[PDB]
Write a protein that binds this ligand. Structure first.
Ligand SMILES: C[C@@H]1O[C@@H](O[C@H]2[C@H](O[C@H]3[C@H](O)[C@@H](O)[C@@H](O)O[C@@H]3CO)O[C@H](CO)[C@H](O)[C@@H]2O)[C@@H](O)[C@H](O)[C@@H]1O
Ligand SMILES: C[C@@H]1O[C@@H](O[C@H]2[C@H](O[C@H]3[C@H](O)[C@@H](O)[C@@H](O)O[C@@H]3CO)O[C@H](CO)[C@H](O)[C@@H]2O)[C@@H](O)[C@H](O)[C@@H]1O
Lengths: 309, 309
C-alpha cells in the first residue's frame, strides 16, 4: 500500500518513437488481431520496468548489426559474424531470443554496410539487404547474411556495421504481402526453435482490441507493406525501465486528453505486462490532436469495462 | 526551498545515445577547447528541461530530412523542398536556428533518399549525400541539396525522406580534416547570419575542461574524422525535459560511480545551462567500467573546486 505512483510520460504520439524500427511514431491504430499471432520481441517491457524479449533501451540500435564480414566467393553476398554492440565478442549464452535489438519480423530490410580499416582509417559504405526469413538468418548463433552491390570492396577482419533504412518487396511476392510484421524470424536459423520469447498478446475481454502505435517504414524498392505496429512507444519502455513503479493491479486505466478542449478523447487499458487495449470493433485510424497525450488515472482490473473508443 | 529533487538517469554510457547523430554513445573524453568554438545546436537543454538550439526529443530524427525533390536537369543532384517532420508544410517562422534535428556541423553526410509514390505505393531508395557546408545548404529557408547515384528515378511532388548513415571525406581535403564537428552550418545559406542559437560553451574555472560524450560516426568513403562529441546524452535531454526539476544553484555536482568497487571514479560539474566540466588538463580518454553511472549528489556553485579527475 502507498507504493511509488505509476505514471506514463507526457509525450505526444509525434514526439515518440517506434520500438520496432528506428523511426518516429505517426499515429494510433486499432483493429482485430485474431487472424495473426501478435508476438513482437522489440518494444516489450512490463509497467514496472522489466525488459522482455529482445528489447533494449535506445531506439537507434534497433535493427542494427555489427561484426566482421566474410565474402561468399563468386557473389556479392557477405556473411557477418556478429559482435556485441560495443564491438566486444558476441556472447550467445544470455537467456534472450537473439541479441537485443535484432529484427523481430520477417522481411527484406535494406540499409548500408559501413566499414573502417583500423590501420589507416580508410572507410567504405555500400547498399546492403538482409532477409530475415532466410534459412541462414541466425543472429542467435551470431550469423547473418547481406546481399550487397559489391564483390570486392569489403575487407575481412575489420569492424563493419549495418544501419537499417527501410524495407523492400521483390522476388515475385504479391504487392504489399511482405514484409510480414507479425511473423517472427527463426533466430537460430531454419528449423530451430526460438527461445526466451516475450509472450504473444491478445485482447481477451469482449469488445476489446489491441491499440497499436504505428509508423510507416521507408520503402526502398517494389511495393512493400510499410505498416509497422508496436505495443509500446520506445519512450514508454525507457520510462518504465527508469521509474520501475510497482503495478497495483493488472491494468492501468489511461485517458487520452485533448489540451485544445480539455476533454478526454478516449480511454484504454495499459496491461501491466506491457500492451494496450481499447473498446472497439473494427479497423480504425484514430483521429487525434497532435498535442494529445496519455494520462494515467487509476489502477483497475482486467474485468473493467472501458467506455467505447 | 524544498523544490522537486533534481536527478540524472541511472543509465550507463553504453546504454545512451549521441544527441548529435543517431548512434550510441561509446565513451567519455576530455580535452582542451580553447582553439575552437563549442556551439553545437543539437543536444542542448537546461537541467530544468528547456530545450535549446535545434534540439528535439527523439534521437532517430537527428540529421533526417523530409520533403519533396526537384531534379537538377543534367545532373544526379536534387533539391529538397523541406516539409515538417510529420509531412505538414514547413513553417520557417519558429524562433529556432533551423528545423529541429538539422545537422549542426559542417560535413558531407551520406545516407539514403527513399520515396513512395502515393497512387500505387511503389517505392525507391538511392544513395544520397548532403554537404552541410554547401553555399545552398539552407534548411532554415526550407531548402537542401542531395547528390545521388541517379538522374531519373526520383519523382517530383512525392514524399521523400533522407535517412543518415555516416560521413565521407573527398574532394582533396586533408585526411581527417573533415567533417568539422565544431563548425556550424550557415542555416539560411552562404553569407546569411544564423539566428536563435544556443550559446557557445567553455570551461571558465582554472584547471577545468569540458567533458564530452563521444561516439564514432560511421565512415562511408575516404578518410573522415569520425569523432563526434555531444554535451549531453540524448537521454539526459529527454529526462530533464520530462522531470523539469528546478536548478537550486548554477551547478549540479555529479559523481561517477563504479558498482564493481562501490567507489567514486571521478566527479564533475553539470552546469544548469546544460554542459559538463571536469578538473583535468590535457586530452584524455576516460577508462570507465561499462556498468558505471552518474549520480547527482549536491547543488554547488560555479566556484566549487572539483577533485582532479
Ligand atoms: C515499384 C518500383 O520499385 C522499384 O523498381 C523495382 C521494380 O519494380 C517494378 C515492378 O516489379 C513491376 O511489377 C512494375 O510495377 O514496374 C516496377 C518498376 O517499373 O522491380 C525490380 C525487380 O522486378 C526492382 O525491385 C526495382 O527496384 C523502383 O525503383 C521503381 O521506381 C518503382 O517504385
Ligand atoms: C580510403 C578509401 O575510401 C573509399 O575509396 C575512396 C577513394 O579513396 C582513395 C584515396 O582518395 C586515395 O588517397 C588513396 O588512399 O586510395 C583510396 C582508395 O584506394 O577515393 C575516391 C575519390 O578519390 C572515392 O571517394 C572512394 O570512395 C573506399 O571505397 C576504399 O575502400 C578506401 O576505404
Amino acid at each position: 500500500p502507498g507504493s511509488k505512483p505509476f505514471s506514463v510520460p507526457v509525450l505526444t504520439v509525434e514526439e515518440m518513437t517506434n520500438s520496432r524500427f528506428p523511426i518516429p511514431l505517426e499515429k494510433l491504430f486499432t483493429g482485430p488481431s485474431s487472424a495473426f499471432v501478435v508476438q513482437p520481441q522489440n518494444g516489450r517491457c512490463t509497467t514496472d520496468g522489466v525488459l522482455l524479449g529482445t528489447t533494449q533501451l535506445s531506439p537507434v540500435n534497433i535493427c542494427t548489426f555489427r561484426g566482421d564480414v566474410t565474402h561468399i566467393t563468386g557473389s556479392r553476398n557477405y556473411t557477418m559474424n556478429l559482435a556485441s554492440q560495443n564491438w566486444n565478442d558476441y556472447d550467445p549464452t544470455e537467456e534472450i531470443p537473439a541479441p537485443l535489438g535484432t529484427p523481430d519480423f520477417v522481411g527484406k530490410i535494406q540499409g548500408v554496410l559501413t566499414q573502417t580499416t583500423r590501420t589507416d582509417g580508410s572507410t567504405r559504405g555500400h547498399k546492403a539487404t538482409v532477409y530475415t526469413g532466410s534459412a541462414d538468418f541466425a543472429p542467435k548463433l551470431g550469423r547473418v547474411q547481406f546481399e550487397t552491390d559489391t564483390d570486392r570492396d569489403f575487407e575481412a577482419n575489420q569492424n563493419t556495421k549495418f544501419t537499417p533504412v527501410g524495407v523492400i518487396q521483390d522476388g515475385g511476392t504479391t504487392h504489399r504481402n511482405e514484409p510480414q510484421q507479425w511473423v517472427l524470424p527463426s533466430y537460430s536459423g531454419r528449423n530451430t526453435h526460438n527461445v526466451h520469447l516475450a509472450p504473444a498478446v491478445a485482447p481477451t475481454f469482449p469488445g476489446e482490441q489491441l491499440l497499436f502505435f504505428r509508423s510507416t517504414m521507408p520503402g526502398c524498392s517494389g511495393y512493400p507493406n510499410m505498416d509497422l505496429d508496436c505495443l509500446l512507444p520506445q519512450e514508454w519502455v525507457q520510462y518504465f525501465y527508469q521509474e520501475a513503479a510497482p503495478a497495483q493491479s493488472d491494468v492501468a486505466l489511461l485517458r487520452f486528453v485533448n489540451p485544445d478542449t480539455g476533454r478526454v478523447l478516449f480511454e484504454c487499458k495499459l496491461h501491466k505486462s506491457g500492451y494496450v487495449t481499447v473498446a472497439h470493433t473494427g479497423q480504425h485510424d484514430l483521429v487525434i490532436p497532435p498535442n494529445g497525450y496519455f494520462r494515467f488515472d487509476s489502477w483497475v482490473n482486467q474485468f473493467y469495462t472501458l467506455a467505447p473508443m
